[PDB]
Design an enzyme around this catalytic site. Sequence first.
Site, mmCIF file in Angstrom:
data_model
loop_
_atom_site.group_PDB
_atom_site.id
_atom_site.type_symbol
_atom_site.label_atom_id
_atom_site.label_comp_id
_atom_site.label_asym_id
_atom_site.label_seq_id
_atom_site.Cartn_x
_atom_site.Cartn_y
_atom_site.Cartn_z
ATOM 1 N N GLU A 219 78.514 -66.541 -18.836
ATOM 2 C CA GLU A 219 78.885 -65.984 -17.541
ATOM 3 C C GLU A 219 79.014 -67.197 -16.627
ATOM 4 O OE1 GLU A 219 75.154 -63.813 -17.571
ATOM 5 O OE2 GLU A 219 76.266 -61.924 -17.692
ATOM 6 N N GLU B 115 77.810 -77.954 13.033
ATOM 7 C CA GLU B 115 76.458 -77.398 13.046
ATOM 8 C C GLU B 115 75.496 -78.041 14.040
ATOM 9 O OE1 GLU B 115 75.094 -77.393 8.862
ATOM 10 O OE2 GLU B 115 75.878 -75.361 8.739
ATOM 11 N N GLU C 292 77.250 -75.538 20.877
ATOM 12 C CA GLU C 292 76.219 -75.040 19.968
ATOM 13 C C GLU C 292 76.690 -73.977 18.970
ATOM 14 O OE1 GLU C 292 73.690 -71.960 21.180
ATOM 15 O OE2 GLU C 292 73.562 -71.894 18.992
#
Lengths: 159, 159
Positions: free
Chosen positions: B19, B76, B117
């Site tokens: 997988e 960020e 921000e």
Amino acid sequence: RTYLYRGRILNLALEGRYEIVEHKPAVAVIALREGRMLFVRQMRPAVGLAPLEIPAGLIEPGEDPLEAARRELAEETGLSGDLTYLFSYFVSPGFTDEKTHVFLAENLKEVEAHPDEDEAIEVVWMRPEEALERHQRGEVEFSATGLVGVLYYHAFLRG
Amino acid sequence: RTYLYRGRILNLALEGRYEIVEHKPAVAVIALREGRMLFVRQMRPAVGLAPLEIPAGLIEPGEDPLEAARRELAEETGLSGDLTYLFSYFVSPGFTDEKTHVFLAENLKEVEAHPDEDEAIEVVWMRPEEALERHQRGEVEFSATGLVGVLYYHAFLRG
Ligand SMILES: Nc1ncnc2c1ncn2[C@@H]1O[C@H](COP(=O)(O)OP(=O)(O)OC[C@H]2O[C@@H](O)[C@H](O)[C@@H]2O)[C@@H](O)[C@H]1O
Ligand SMILES: Nc1ncnc2c1ncn2[C@@H]1O[C@H](COP(=O)(O)OP(=O)(O)OC[C@H]2O[C@@H](O)[C@H](O)[C@@H]2O)[C@@H](O)[C@H]1O
Ligand SMILES: [Gd]
Ligand SMILES: [Gd]
Ligand SMILES: [Gd]
Ligand SMILES: [Gd]
Ligand SMILES: [Gd]
Ligand SMILES: [Gd]
Ligand SMILES: [Gd]
Ligand SMILES: [Gd]
């Protein structure tokens, strides 16, 4: 959380717009001996190469981290030792919940008279300094466990 | 390799009995200033908690690692700096191909007069020693990027 797929080592689900992959937790073992760290390499279909890792594996049903750590070290290297829990980390919290528990192995000893080698794994004892050096030149790749082991060494095991 | 799902940040495929989860590569930025490392925390639906991480993100189409590192730090934290490529690692080669590129940021400077921000992120300047200490008591969790930053600090940035 709706599931799109339930598999062997993972499930694929959706939570709103978030694609989530549930994955069993894992363990990793840092082992140092005579200036060499015990790295391991194996065929990794997901990446198409064999990065430099350290003994590691998924925690099996019925096991706690410490027990899985002992089993993986034993099964991949045929060794046992005095394990110490160091820390844990989520491999990629942005999409999966796989959490890895790292242990330090000391006083390594053969698990049995003649250890039963693991064909799928390649044991690579190497100086952590060399692993980092070579990686820096693009000669070898690292798995998170391998890099964590190398950094841990440089931070607390030198001398 | 047959695909079961093609999504936004990942695809789920099967290769034989394996997988596999294809995931975009990522970047992480270690930044130290006055004995404090710039950690970040955000809601992580996949794990149900906000682990201690460092500025990081997926590399966007058209970007190379260095460029994505600059963007993530800027978006960020609203900061820029002189970046240095340190190393890379596969987060979990056992099932995914996500590869993370780590950079060091020095000479941090405001990207603009009044940085904009990021509401989804919580900036946490903290001594790497404290992060590790608290994690050791089970008071805070680590993402691979957060732990790598902490270990890197202890190995090469103290003094
Ligand atoms: N599973 C997800 N499914 C859909 N959108 C997502 C997912 N995770 C994040 N996003 C979206 O992508 C934006 C953030 O993109 P990135 O730059 O990739 O950063 P982020 O995902 O927040 O952190 C990246 C890195 O940290 C670890 O969690 C992880 O290993 C990843 O490589 C966010 O605004 C958010 O809406
Ligand atoms: N994607 C996969 N799909 C199905 N079976 C798998 C897969 N990956 C490994 N296996 C099977 O599971 C056995 C190994 O199990 P584990 O103990 O979990 O160890 P391994 O997967 O080899 O490495 C574990 C850790 O290293 C990193 O790659 C990753 O972060 C993982 O947590 C093997 O015999 C193999 O057949
Ligand atoms: Gd394993
Ligand atoms: Gd195993
Ligand atoms: Gd045996
Ligand atoms: Gd060398
Ligand atoms: Gd991010
Ligand atoms: Gd981002
Ligand atoms: Gd602005
Ligand atoms: Gd403290």
